Design a protein around this ligand. Structure first.
Ligand SMILES: [Mg+2]
Ligand SMILES: [Mg+2]
Ligand SMILES: [Mg+2]
Ligand SMILES: [Mg+2]
Ligand SMILES: [Mg+2]
Ligand SMILES: [Mg+2]
Ligand SMILES: [Mg+2]
Ligand SMILES: [Mg+2]
Lengths: 114, 91, 94, 60, 244, 69
RNA sequence: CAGGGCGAAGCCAGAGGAAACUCUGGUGGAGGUCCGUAGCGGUCCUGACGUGCAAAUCGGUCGUCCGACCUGGGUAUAGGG
RNA sequence: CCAGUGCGGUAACGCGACCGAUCCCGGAGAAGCCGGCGGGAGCCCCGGGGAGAGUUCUCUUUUCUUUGUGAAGGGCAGGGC
RNA sequence: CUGGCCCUUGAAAAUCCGGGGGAGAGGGUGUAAAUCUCGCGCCGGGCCGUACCCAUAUCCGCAGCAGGUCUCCAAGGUGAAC
């Protein structure tokens, strides 16, 4: 076995010097310095644990290179909420208003009676 | 009474700490590593997260309960009394 | 109470247990009593309570658990909601 | 010279009591002979069920 | 001759409080129209717990009724509070668990916590982990109210100041024995450097007045004047009795 | 490097202002047409050895065709 | 921060019992748990050395080795302090 | 004469671009220790072909060495949900 | 992936991002603003560090001193095993 060495002046295994083996065309196993594993966005509702769908999970300053469609998904609240909490925020924003109409007429009949 | 007679959970503390203390810790060490039934979704998923904070796995509710039981008796007898004090005031 | 009448419906009549099957029978219109329990997330309560009012169906707030409804429905498990399609001899329907 | 020895250890030479040094559990972990075994019987009952050999209620 | 430990807890700098990971002060949402006349609303976000405290905190989100924004607080969570509950605040709020009211409004015997000792100080009394403070009796004019604290002492408080209803969550934290020296070091490693405490009888007489001797004895009465100089004032400070 | 899949496509990329040095390796049935550009190096892998020599007579202006060997 | 030992809760079957539950066979892998490398320590020979390799080292034997463990850099506390 | 701030899928979502400020909400940066299991890799191993070696007193289809593809794209495995 | 343990719950900020909202902009029947631009083309990235030892002879112990000094990689055999 040939054993290998670090390549940059850093020699402490850290979150920074995270490596991997690669076989170059010179038959020379060499260290290749990987990138931190990026995580996909979590929902803004704050209840669903899973990271979203339809978005590239990648380190944040990389989102500058990427395209608009890689970063969102084409819906209401797309790319920030999970669509199980969107379809609730629709039919929750419905009946909050509807039973405000119902109390509006029950209040208009309570003063019409009195 | 299989694998042991009367230590159960606190067998993990071995010969140490004295009997009367290992014994007293037992009832506690049972009621905190116990999984209770959520009173929202009904599913047996209430687990202790840290001191006085209880989380439901399924419905992702977090609840401020007792130190190592879901409900201190002091808090339950207060909840009944606080509820009667506002029905006595406002009716 | 309704631990007796429901016990008769499951045995003799037709019924649907749950949601997305109950909601599909208020959609069709062939259901005429939706028995919610407490512990149903007040969103699914208020949305069935309204989705049923539009179809002219009685709603019932069984003082249950979503567990003391499955225990009442002769089932061995968790039923939050339920919709009675057809009664047997049970006058669960008023 | 090593490869000739390992052909003996295939037929069970030099495997006697007098050449064992670790515990029986250290040489073959009883924890591993679940995963070897339970996986074999479970993968059998899975092939037996989808083959309409046994029913669901027999299998469970 | 030396400067005794206990004299040193004042300069700080080692005997100083350990507060990197602490979530922030546990306050009570200072006053405005909403508190002084109405009943401002708000919902509970989470019940995150802070190091060094037995009570869990709660990030409660109101919305600032002056500028389009969302103020977020940290209330010492009353036992029973759950995520998603609506916490209402102010004078017109109704009496149930987790609603902050002015003590002047709620009836006697009400069980409250996170009380204020002067109006507006955003919560000071009865907030530890399992403590509460019972309201005793009112006095309409002079706008004062008598309140029993967990120490059992009774204090006259001005009726204005507010207090959340219910008991502090996390009761009985003292009930399970620490049970091993590790769990103690591991416990104060979140509060400050006051651990393994060496008894004075084991130190040489230059370090602590109860020192010295060819036996580990005290030597002079362990009760001491309240009018003592710092350094002597060690042992039973101004004890009125001494014994079980 | 980018693999161009269509014969007509790099006939456009080989007409750029930035294009230069269309290199031709003969790989024993893979005859490749690497056209260096500012950003990328577009190559076409031809499978039919006849279509390749026909393409040799298409580099329009007098590019720097360097038959690689 | 090798490899092993003991084997806690939980769980599964099988068996008894009327019920409470109790037996038996597994699983499972808890612990300021045991042996024991690395590491950190320094018991005993009252060994070596004792103008030394060394202004405190060196051998054999030893203690501990998932926790009140060991460490690198940054930062704080300065003389009756 | 009007219309045209992109289109597809029932839905998860898809498409190469798809108008837009002050302000607001959220995510990423952004997390302990330990156990178990699975996937990938490098290395280790075994069977068999090449090439060059070693031994050949006798025996050994022998023993030894070596037997490759980077980032960045493009496609599809196999993992996870 | 999935667990256990905690009276221990285990970092902040630059930076970047999506979304809400929708003030405003656009040309008037082929164009126009716009492209969190898709492809492609042009120009630029200054300043300082960068030898070698890393240790039973390049560091500290008055020395080429059995002392001390933080890491990375890490084959065959036997064996449970670094
Ligand atoms: Mg760095
Ligand atoms: Mg997308
Ligand atoms: Mg002494
Ligand atoms: Mg003195
Ligand atoms: Mg000696
Ligand atoms: Mg001598
Ligand atoms: Mg010498
Ligand atoms: Mg160099």
């Amino acid at each position: 076995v040939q054993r290998l060495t670090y390549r940059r002046r850093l020699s402490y295994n850290t979150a920074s010097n995270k490596t991997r083996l690669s076989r170059t065309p010179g038959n020379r196993i060499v260290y290749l310095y990987t990138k931190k594993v990026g995580k996909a966005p979590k929902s803004a509702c704050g209840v669903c644990p899973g990271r979203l769908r339809g978005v590239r999970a990648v380190r944040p300053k990389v989102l500058m290179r990427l395209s608009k469609t890689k970063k969102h998904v084409s819906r209401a609240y797309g790319g920030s909420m999970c669509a199980k909490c969107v379809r609730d925020r629709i039919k929750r924003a419905f009946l909050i208003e509807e039973q405000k109409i119902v109390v509006k007429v029950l209040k208009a009949q309570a003063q019409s009676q009195k | 009474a299989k694998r042991t007679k009367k230590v159960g959970i606190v067998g993990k503390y071995g010969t140490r700490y004295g009997a009367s203390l290992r014994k007293m810790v037992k009832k506690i060490e049972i009621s905190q590593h116990a999984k209770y039934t959520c009173s929202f979704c009904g599913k047996t998923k209430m687990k202790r997260r840290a001191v006085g904070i209880w989380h439901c796995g399924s419905c992702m509710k977090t609840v401020a309960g007792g130190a190592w039981t879901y409900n201190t008796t002091s808090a339950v007898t207060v909840k009944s009394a606080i509820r009667r004090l506002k029905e006595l005031k406002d009716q | 109470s309704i631990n007796s009448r429901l016990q008769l419906v499951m045995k003799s009549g037709k019924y649907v247990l749950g949601y997305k099957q109950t909601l599909k029978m208020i959609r069709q219109g062939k259901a005429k009593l939706v028995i919610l329990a407490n512990n149903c997330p007040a969103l699914r309560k208020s949305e069935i309570e309204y989705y049923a009012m539009l179809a002219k169906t009685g709603v019932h707030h069984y003082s249950g658990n979503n567990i003391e409804l499955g225990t009442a429905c002769g089932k061995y498990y968790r039923v939050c909601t339920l919709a009675i399609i057809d009664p047997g001899d049970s006058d669960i329907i008023r | 010279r090593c490869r000739k020895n390992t052909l003996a250890r295939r037929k069970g030479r030099h495997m006697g009591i007098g050449k064992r040094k670790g515990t029986a559990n250290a040489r073959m972990p009883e924890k591993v002979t679940w995963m070897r075994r339970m996986r074999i019987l479970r993968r059998l009952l899975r092939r037996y069920r989808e083959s309409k050999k046994i029913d669901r209620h027999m299998y469970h | 001759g030396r400067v005794i430990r206990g004299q040193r807890k004042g300069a700080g700098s080692v005997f100083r409080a350990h507060v990197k990971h602490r979530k922030g002060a546990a306050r009570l949402r200072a006053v405005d129209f909403a508190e002084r006349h109405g009943y401002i609303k708000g919902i509970v976000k989470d019940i995150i717990h802070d190091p060094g405290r037995g009570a869990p905190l709660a990030k409660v989100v109101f919305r600032d009724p002056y500028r389009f924004k969302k103020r977020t607080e940290l209330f010492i969570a009353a036992e029973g509070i759950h995520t998603g509950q609506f916490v209402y605040c102010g004078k017109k709020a109704q009496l149930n668990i987790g609603n902050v009211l002015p003590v002047g409004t709620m009836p006697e015997g009400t069980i409250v916590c996170c009380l204020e000792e002067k109006p507006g100080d955003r919560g000071k009394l009865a907030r530890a982990s399992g403590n509460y403070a019972t309201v005793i009796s009112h006095n309409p004019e002079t706008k004062k109210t008598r309140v029993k604290l967990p120490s059992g002492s009774k204090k006259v408080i001005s009726s204005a100041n507010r207090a959340v209803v219910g008991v502090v969550a996390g009761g009985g934290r003292i009930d399970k024995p620490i049970l091993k020296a590790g769990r103690a070091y591991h416990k104060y490693k979140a509060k400050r450097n006051c651990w393994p405490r060496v008894r004075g009888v084991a130190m040489n007489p230059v370090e602590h007045p109860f020192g010295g001797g060819n036996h580990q004895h005290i030597g002079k009465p362990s009760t001491i004047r309240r009018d003592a100089p710092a350094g002597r004032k060690v042992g039973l400070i101004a004890a009125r009795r001494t014994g079980r | 490097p980018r693999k161009i899949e269509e014969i007509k496509d790099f006939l456009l990329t080989a007409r750029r202002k930035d294009a230069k040095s269309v290199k031709i390796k003969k790989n024993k049935d893979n005859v490749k047409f690497k056209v260096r550009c500012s950003r990328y190096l577009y190559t076409l892998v031809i499978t039919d050895k006849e279509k390749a020599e026909k393409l040799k007579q298409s580099l329009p202006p007098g590019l720097a065709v360097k038959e690689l060997k």
